[PDB]
Ligand binder design. Sequence first.
Ligand SMILES: NC(=O)c1ccc[n+]([C@@H]2O[C@H](COP(=O)([O-])OP(=O)(O)OC[C@H]3O[C@@H](n4cnc5c(N)ncnc54)[C@H](OP(=O)(O)O)[C@@H]3O)[C@@H](O)[C@H]2O)c1
Ligand SMILES: O=C(O)COc1cc(F)ccc1C(=O)NCc1cccc(C(=O)O)c1
Length: 316
Amino acid sequence: MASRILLNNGAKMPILGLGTWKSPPGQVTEAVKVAIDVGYRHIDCAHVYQNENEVGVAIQEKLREQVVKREELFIVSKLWCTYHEKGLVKGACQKTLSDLKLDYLDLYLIHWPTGFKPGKEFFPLDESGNVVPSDTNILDTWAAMEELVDEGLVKAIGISNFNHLQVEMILNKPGLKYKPAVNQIECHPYLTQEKLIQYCQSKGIVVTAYSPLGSPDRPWAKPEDPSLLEDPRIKAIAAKHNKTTAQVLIRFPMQRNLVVIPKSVTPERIAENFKVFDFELSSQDMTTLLSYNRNWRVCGGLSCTSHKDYPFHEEF
Ligand SMILES: NC(=O)c1ccc[n+]([C@@H]2O[C@H](COP(=O)([O-])OP(=O)(O)OC[C@H]3O[C@@H](n4cnc5c(N)ncnc54)[C@H](OP(=O)(O)O)[C@@H]3O)[C@@H](O)[C@H]2O)c1
Ligand SMILES: O=C(O)COc1cc(F)ccc1C(=O)NCc1cccc(C(=O)O)c1
């Protein structure tokens, strides 16, 4: 299978990337160095993850060592919710660029459709515990993202955790200058996303699947939650193909024309997770994996359910 997918800005994006949410700052530099050494060319980042400086150390070393050229890397970051105001977007992007040791991003995403009050706190709260929203809507934030393209800071812009009506709002924006290149959403066999994926693909928007392994290290995991990596039905498909369960979970979105961004800081797993271009799931395997959908979300945003732009009230 081909290693890159063509975006609607004319650039090619590697279909496998390394995730970095929860990667400890003291381990992520080595993780990214290992990833680049074993073939990864796409790193998924975000300011809210609090480790972009350390990710950047790895990128810069591998560029200095000439393991890769900058044009061969595809670096993604995301605008956090407290920076949706038009006057804050450029500085937020520039802080990410500074931290990552880059003079452009390949892709910059609106991390969530919900804007929050600016300030030091990433989740500003009222005295009763509700997140304090911003009054800047998604269309004005989108225009600010378009400016970043026109200033050379980013090669592509996109969105993340946008439902289909929110994607449609961007596509129908008066005076839209650049369509979103990507919508990055949670997707795995327990949250298969058929409706939202087909909508985005039908509009030429590439979908990136996050938490493809079910995020076993998510900080809010409960024992009662379903576990993809331990699901005997998925293990059986992996055994049949002589691959690991993680390798099946990574190959699955690839065969749906998605980009996928598994996270690891474990060198052996970083290498394992990349060895997914040497086998094929059958159509029956794919339909079987799709059948496991239960609309289960790692990232449910349960604390933002009253925000006017909360994405997960709508069916898709
Ligand atoms: N846009 C958004 O709102 C958003 C939200 C969530 C995630 N994301 C992005 O998507 C990335 C991936 O999602 P995620 O971090 O939630 O979780 P994930 O990639 O589904 O799972 C990561 C977990 O799986 C473990 N793991 C990795 N490879 C493994 C393997 N081969 N065998 C067994 N365990 C393995 C990792 O352990 P070790 O690290 O200890 O090896 C870690 O605990 C994030 O890091 C972030 O970049 C974006
Ligand atoms: O967001 C990610 O990439 C991974 O999760 C996180 C990572 C962090 F470093 C810090 C917080 C989160 C988090 O709570 N996300 C969920 C979230 C965030 C903002 C709004 C909504 C909403 O439902 O509107 C939902």
